[PDB]
């Protein structure tokens, strides 16, 4: 037997990272824009 995960598995893996990064950048931006409020 042999199995492997495909490229779309890794495409789901890399796309996991960018969602969690920008959500921190939302709270970066929200704390930054709350300073101006």
3-state secondary structure of 4: coil
Q: Distance (Å, rounded) from C-alpha 20 to C-alpha 14?
A: 11
Task: Specify the residue for token string 């492997």.
Answer: 4
| Residue 26: HSE in the Cβ half-sphere, 13 Å Cα cutoff | 6
* DSSP-assigned letters across all residues of the chain: ------HHHHHHHHHHHHHHHHHHHHHHHHHHHHHH-
Alpha-carbon distances of 34 from 1, 20, 22, rounded to whole Å = 57, 21, 18
Q: How was this structure determined?
A: cryo-EM
Task: Specify the residue for token string 């921190």.
Answer: 24
Would you state the structure tokens that stand for residue 18, as one six-digit string? 């960018």
């Amino acid at each position: 037997f042999n199995y492997k995960y495909g490229w779309s598995f890794a495409f789901a893996a890399i796309s996991f990272l960018l969602t969690e990064s920008a959500g921190v950048m939302s709270v970066y931006l929200f704390m930054k824009r709350y300073t101006a409020e």
